[PDB]
Amino acid sequence: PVTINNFNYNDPIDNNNIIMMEPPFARGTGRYYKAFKITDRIWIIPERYTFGYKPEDFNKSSGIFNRDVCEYYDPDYLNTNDKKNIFLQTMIKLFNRIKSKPLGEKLLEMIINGIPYLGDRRVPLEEFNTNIASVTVNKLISNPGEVERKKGIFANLIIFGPGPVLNENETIDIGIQNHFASREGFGGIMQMKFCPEYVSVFNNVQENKGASIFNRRGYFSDPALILMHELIHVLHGLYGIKVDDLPIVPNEKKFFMQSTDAIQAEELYTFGGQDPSIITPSTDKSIYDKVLQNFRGIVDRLNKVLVCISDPNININIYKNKFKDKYKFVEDSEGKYSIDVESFDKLYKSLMFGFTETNIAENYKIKTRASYFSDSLPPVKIKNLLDNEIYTIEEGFNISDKDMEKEYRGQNKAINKQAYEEISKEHLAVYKIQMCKSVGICIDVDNEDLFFIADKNSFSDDLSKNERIEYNTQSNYIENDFPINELILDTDLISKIELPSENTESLTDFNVDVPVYEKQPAIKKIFTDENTIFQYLYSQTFPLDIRDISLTSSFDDALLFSNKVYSFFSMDYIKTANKVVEAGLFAGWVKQIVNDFVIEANKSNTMDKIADISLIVPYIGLALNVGNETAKGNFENAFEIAGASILLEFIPELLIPVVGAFLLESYIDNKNKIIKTIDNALTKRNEKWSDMYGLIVAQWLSTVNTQFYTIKEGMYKALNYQAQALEEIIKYRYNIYSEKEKSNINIDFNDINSKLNEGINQAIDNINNFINGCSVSYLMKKMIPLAVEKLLDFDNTLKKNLLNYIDENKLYLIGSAEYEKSKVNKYLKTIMPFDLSIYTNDTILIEMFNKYNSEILNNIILNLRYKDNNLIDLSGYGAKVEVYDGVELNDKNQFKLTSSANSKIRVTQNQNIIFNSVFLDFSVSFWIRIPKYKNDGIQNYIHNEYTIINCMKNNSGWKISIRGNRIIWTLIDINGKTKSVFFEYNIREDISEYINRWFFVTITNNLNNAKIYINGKLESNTDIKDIREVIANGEIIFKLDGDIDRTQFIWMKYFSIFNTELSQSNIEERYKIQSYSEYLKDFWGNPLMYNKEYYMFNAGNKNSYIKLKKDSPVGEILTRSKYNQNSKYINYRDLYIGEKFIIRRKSNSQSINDDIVRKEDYIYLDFFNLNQEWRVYTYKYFKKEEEKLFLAPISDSDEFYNTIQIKEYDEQPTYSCQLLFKKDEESTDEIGLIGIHRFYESGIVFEEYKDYFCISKWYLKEVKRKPYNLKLGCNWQFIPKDEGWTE
Ligand SMILES: [Ca+2]
Ligand SMILES: [Ca+2]
Ligand SMILES: [Zn+2]
């Protein structure tokens, strides 16, 4: 157990637990400090830390000490005895809180027992030397006014009050002659400057601070956790493992980059959470090795120590026993000490990954910042930590008896205001970057708001070094984790070995290095005319002395005029916001503009499914103009083209080492040592893949995800500026009214702010999801593949290396040089899939990853789309696409492959995508339109198979071919074994749903089957179990290849590939998404057009067509003529028959050239009667359910309706459309739908039934039925002449 002593500042010095100490940095000169032993080996000196600081620097100035901290200054802190005593009692309370739980009690026990080794690097291995400043500190015994009598004591930790900056807590180690005992295995007296009352404030981006933009946001820290964070540094320093290694260094070559001190791995380890992941596995092992090497030096010292010259009273055995336990060394029955690898590993992991701020916070139910790399806010002052009503030893601020335990409400600034006070801004100093234009207006930007982008020098290149493989050689992995529960239950973690007495000889060698600090300018001026994130955010603000502003979509005007505020919301939103109204209409206007605000903000939920993008925030570019000028043009389009990359302010140069070669050592005549070597080399190979992935993750988190974090914060600020601006306008307009008017105005400012705030919260959630998706996308498509390329290269090099090794030892391997030959091929065959959870256990990051992998669209590895008269891959993997001259392309994303040799597309796929999952798993989807057979060429049509898409490599791959009315999918494995599955449509149907009509094809492949889906429905299936490996990343050639007719062609659209098997559900969804359009379509599936001649088809009367009756102004219905020749393979009904209709636009006299017909358009349905254009009319006064339509010349009669509304009542994909007659555009009076009706005719000569072109009210209720009735006689399709259909 840990005992925390009690005392008052004025208690008498007793030279034991209350002393006059001579601090290490005093160099044995100057004055002494009254110090209090709070626990064994730990001292508290309730006075400001002044070592290395100028007295005046304790005042706020035009300078700052740290570039990444909102620095608070207060020279009066601790300037009285009562203030010093309060500091003392507060420290006692914090220590009691720390030991209130086993985890914290153990941290203290480890620290108390982690006594510094007696000596350092300069001390002979045979000796213990206490006469060094890192081991002994002196206390003055003599009476006041004379340093006549001094006594030495051993100490572990000395905690002082703060230095100039109250909120800048720091743990300091002792350097002597340029070396640090605490960094070389020995450990040394540790010092700390700490302030309990002025604590840091933080706010989680992904989480709302009580969700109130008009209230105080964020949470304040529990000083006990802040102290434990420092105590962890103390722990590391005491065990001598606070080693230095390759640090994370910020790139500062660009003006938008955050400047900061180099960050050592030890600091990131101390924080925990995701931060250890920024330290590559290479560096993790580097640090591990250095610490182990340091301990070896200590264990050697224990085996050689014979005496202590500095203090004859030191019992050598007692210390050897204590140090053996401290470092967890093992000792044999003879007393020989050695390192136990298991015990060392456990100790190391416990100290680096067990005791972390994140783990401690979690255990103590204390909320803390999400990461070391999270913006810093202004600190606050805790009113009274000694008041149990506000802060307790057991629960800190989150007191359950006050219902503040839930959701860390006790630390919530918006909720627990009674616990703290805001700090006077006049006492705060912050490093700012003054961005000046070349003229010249300037904008100040806190350095903390800039992008933190780790420089390339931050990462280890150890992966490029060679590795000697031996029967020995084993894997090397360091799990940046340690089960906190076992640590809390570990029975032998805490020492039960006697702590030596602290009294020793007085220190006489005061040699020590004392740091010297100095402020630097708080403002750095730079010149740039760039208008990026900082400038855009700035344009959305207004000075405090202005109260009348107006919104503008002009960024430039917003910068020029103080009364103009930039807004990235719609033109209509902006206009309405600037509208001035009468008091009587003010309440209405407020409701309107506030509602508009929510609508605008909610556009952050916009979907873009047709472009294979589930979510996109269209206004991010306009809001920040971050990255590659995202404020220009249409952001959504730009995103569809370049993806996440366009949002990055800077594209990082990644470190992706050429993996060093392996050196396989041979063992002649040794069958085992040779086999072992081969195996070890294989396992080491995987370590290489893992370490590379870890190197990628570290860079992604410190150079990319950091930039996206800044963008998320930027959008939060942007949205708030918009709400603040609207709030300002509303206030101004309301205050223009008189008191009498105001009294009659029904407005609730809190309800307004509530609605605005809620809108922002909804938007932020979408924005965070969007940005996290972008971050993972960059990782997977722009980083991982580049690493895979090197790893695959490495594999190849290692492959022949191993085979050539199995060759050189062929003899010594006898009848096995083949068994292990394949053992190498099959091992280097299956590559390691990237799993983020392997490099981090951070829930946020893991969830981001899993979410990404759960989105089927992220499985797209090829997406050929039209953009600027060319076809490019928008999958994000950058396939090279060569479209040759003979390929016809249009903006409807359709492309035509003809019989010409130059009508082809060459696609070179990305070779670094996990495609060969080792069992075949991928899908291909596309739309196609295959022309009808030539009647005089039917034999060749059914006989000649021709390839249309071929993807082969090493005589293995896949291809899509066509043989007449059959489309074929074929797979060929490395052995040449072939399997096919096909879809063949009937060519004897009166009316075919497939011939010359666009239809959707989807082919899926898995370990068992090959399936072909047509328009979302499964059509064919082939068992492909026997098929072995199939290379599918070869070049893809789109070209008609075979014995084809010169007239042969094929149209294709939306070609894409998925590296997974699509489900029937995925396919059906894709079919509907790609079928969707605002416009109606024609019989063939193309957009329906105005001013284009069409024959009419009736889905409910397939073989019927319309003809103007010779003797009457009506359309009689006749039977389609049919294929006349004698071929046994074909049959169809003629399509180019009946009246030639033409659709004309109703309004806008923009002439009659042509255009696209959209659902709900009002039209005129006309047709040609010889040299005249006639029209389809409905007699206005029929009383029956239906009537024959009236066909006559164009004219305007008061007795006939002439306006039709084209409709689409079917919710599912169809090329059918309906035609409605309404009394007039305005009314909701429906006359009926155009269809076909059967009439009975009994004349003097003939008696029979005849069908006529009619309008009927009966259809009105029928089109509402579900599922939509495709057989209804009111379903029509328009057939224009098409080269793909001849008769
Ligand atoms: Ca790491
Ligand atoms: Ca302005
Ligand atoms: Zn730290």
GROMACS .gro file of N, CA and C in nm, residues 94-143:
model
  150
   94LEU      N    1  -0.483   1.511  -0.463
   94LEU     CA    2  -0.463   1.446  -0.593
   94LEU      C    3  -0.395   1.309  -0.576
   95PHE      N    4  -0.295   1.301  -0.488
   95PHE     CA    5  -0.228   1.174  -0.465
   95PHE      C    6  -0.327   1.074  -0.405
   96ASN      N    7  -0.413   1.121  -0.315
   96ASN     CA    8  -0.512   1.030  -0.257
   96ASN      C    9  -0.607   0.981  -0.366
   97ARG      N   10  -0.643   1.070  -0.458
   97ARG     CA   11  -0.732   1.028  -0.566
   97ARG      C   12  -0.662   0.924  -0.652
   98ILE      N   13  -0.533   0.946  -0.678
   98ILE     CA   14  -0.458   0.853  -0.760
   98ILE      C   15  -0.453   0.713  -0.700
   99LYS      N   16  -0.428   0.704  -0.570
   99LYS     CA   17  -0.420   0.572  -0.508
   99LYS      C   18  -0.557   0.511  -0.476
  100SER      N   19  -0.664   0.585  -0.505
  100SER     CA   20  -0.800   0.538  -0.479
  100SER      C   21  -0.836   0.416  -0.564
  101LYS      N   22  -0.755   0.387  -0.665
  101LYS     CA   23  -0.778   0.271  -0.749
  101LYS      C   24  -0.647   0.195  -0.762
  102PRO      N   25  -0.654   0.061  -0.770
  102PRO     CA   26  -0.533  -0.021  -0.781
  102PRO      C   27  -0.436   0.021  -0.891
  103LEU      N   28  -0.488   0.060  -1.007
  103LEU     CA   29  -0.403   0.101  -1.117
  103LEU      C   30  -0.315   0.221  -1.080
  104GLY      N   31  -0.374   0.321  -1.016
  104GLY     CA   32  -0.299   0.439  -0.976
  104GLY      C   33  -0.210   0.410  -0.857
  105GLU      N   34  -0.256   0.323  -0.768
  105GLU     CA   35  -0.177   0.286  -0.651
  105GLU      C   36  -0.051   0.216  -0.700
  106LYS      N   37  -0.065   0.134  -0.803
  106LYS     CA   38   0.050   0.062  -0.857
  106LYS      C   39   0.147   0.156  -0.930
  107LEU      N   40   0.094   0.259  -0.994
  107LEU     CA   41   0.180   0.356  -1.062
  107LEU      C   42   0.268   0.421  -0.955
  108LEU      N   43   0.206   0.461  -0.844
  108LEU     CA   44   0.280   0.523  -0.735
  108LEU      C   45   0.382   0.427  -0.675
  109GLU      N   46   0.341   0.302  -0.651
  109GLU     CA   47   0.431   0.202  -0.593
  109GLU      C   48   0.552   0.178  -0.685
  110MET      N   49   0.527   0.169  -0.815
  110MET     CA   50   0.635   0.148  -0.910
  110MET      C   51   0.730   0.267  -0.905
  111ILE      N   52   0.675   0.388  -0.896
  111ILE     CA   53   0.758   0.508  -0.892
  111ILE      C   54   0.841   0.518  -0.764
  112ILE      N   55   0.778   0.487  -0.651
  112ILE     CA   56   0.848   0.491  -0.522
  112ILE      C   57   0.960   0.389  -0.515
  113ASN      N   58   0.935   0.270  -0.568
  113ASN     CA   59   1.034   0.163  -0.566
  113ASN      C   60   1.135   0.168  -0.680
  114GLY      N   61   1.108   0.250  -0.781
  114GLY     CA   62   1.199   0.262  -0.894
  114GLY      C   63   1.317   0.354  -0.867
  115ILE      N   64   1.387   0.329  -0.757
  115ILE     CA   65   1.502   0.411  -0.720
  115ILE      C   66   1.612   0.416  -0.827
  116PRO      N   67   1.669   0.535  -0.850
  116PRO     CA   68   1.776   0.548  -0.950
  116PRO      C   69   1.895   0.458  -0.915
  117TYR      N   70   1.959   0.403  -1.017
  117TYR     CA   71   2.077   0.321  -0.995
  117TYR      C   72   2.179   0.416  -0.932
  118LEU      N   73   2.267   0.364  -0.846
  118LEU     CA   74   2.367   0.450  -0.783
  118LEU      C   75   2.486   0.474  -0.877
  119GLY      N   76   2.468   0.567  -0.970
  119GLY     CA   77   2.573   0.600  -1.065
  119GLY      C   78   2.516   0.626  -1.203
  120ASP      N   79   2.605   0.640  -1.301
  120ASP     CA   80   2.564   0.663  -1.440
  120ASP      C   81   2.672   0.608  -1.534
  121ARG      N   82   2.663   0.643  -1.662
  121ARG     CA   83   2.759   0.594  -1.762
  121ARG      C   84   2.907   0.613  -1.728
  122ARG      N   85   2.939   0.718  -1.652
  122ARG     CA   86   3.077   0.748  -1.616
  122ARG      C   87   3.133   0.663  -1.502
  123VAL      N   88   3.045   0.600  -1.425
  123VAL     CA   89   3.088   0.519  -1.311
  123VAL      C   90   3.142   0.382  -1.349
  124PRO      N   91   3.256   0.343  -1.289
  124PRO     CA   92   3.315   0.212  -1.319
  124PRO      C   93   3.213   0.102  -1.290
  125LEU      N   94   3.216  -0.005  -1.370
  125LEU     CA   95   3.124  -0.116  -1.351
  125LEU      C   96   3.131  -0.174  -1.210
  126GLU      N   97   3.249  -0.166  -1.149
  126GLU     CA   98   3.269  -0.220  -1.015
  126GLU      C   99   3.219  -0.133  -0.900
  127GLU      N  100   3.170  -0.013  -0.930
  127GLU     CA  101   3.127   0.075  -0.822
  127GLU      C  102   2.986   0.133  -0.826
  128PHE      N  103   2.944   0.180  -0.709
  128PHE     CA  104   2.817   0.249  -0.687
  128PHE      C  105   2.869   0.387  -0.651
  129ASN      N  106   2.820   0.491  -0.717
  129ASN     CA  107   2.864   0.626  -0.684
  129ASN      C  108   2.741   0.712  -0.660
  130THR      N  109   2.724   0.754  -0.535
  130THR     CA  110   2.610   0.835  -0.497
  130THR      C  111   2.638   0.984  -0.513
  131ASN      N  112   2.765   1.018  -0.533
  131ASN     CA  113   2.805   1.158  -0.545
  131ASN      C  114   2.786   1.221  -0.683
  132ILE      N  115   2.665   1.207  -0.737
  132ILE     CA  116   2.631   1.267  -0.865
  132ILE      C  117   2.493   1.330  -0.847
  133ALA      N  118   2.469   1.441  -0.917
  133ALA     CA  119   2.343   1.515  -0.905
  133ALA      C  120   2.214   1.442  -0.943
  134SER      N  121   2.225   1.326  -1.008
  134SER     CA  122   2.106   1.251  -1.046
  134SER      C  123   2.070   1.146  -0.942
  135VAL      N  124   2.151   1.136  -0.837
  135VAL     CA  125   2.127   1.036  -0.732
  135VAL      C  126   2.103   1.099  -0.595
  136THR      N  127   2.188   1.195  -0.560
  136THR     CA  128   2.181   1.261  -0.431
  136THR      C  129   2.145   1.409  -0.439
  137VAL      N  130   2.056   1.452  -0.349
  137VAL     CA  131   2.015   1.591  -0.339
  137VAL      C  132   2.036   1.625  -0.191
  138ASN      N  133   2.080   1.747  -0.161
  138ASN     CA  134   2.107   1.784  -0.022
  138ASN      C  135   1.999   1.859   0.053
  139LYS      N  136   2.004   1.844   0.186
  139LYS     CA  137   1.912   1.912   0.275
  139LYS      C  138   1.999   1.984   0.376
  140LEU      N  139   1.960   2.106   0.410
  140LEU     CA  140   2.034   2.188   0.506
  140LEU      C  141   1.981   2.162   0.647
  141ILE      N  142   2.069   2.117   0.735
  141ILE     CA  143   2.030   2.088   0.873
  141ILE      C  144   2.054   2.206   0.964
  142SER      N  145   2.169   2.269   0.948
  142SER     CA  146   2.205   2.384   1.030
  142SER      C  147   2.091   2.483   1.050
  143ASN      N  148   2.105   2.567   1.152
  143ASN     CA  149   2.006   2.668   1.186
  143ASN      C  150   1.999   2.774   1.076
   0.00000   0.00000   0.00000
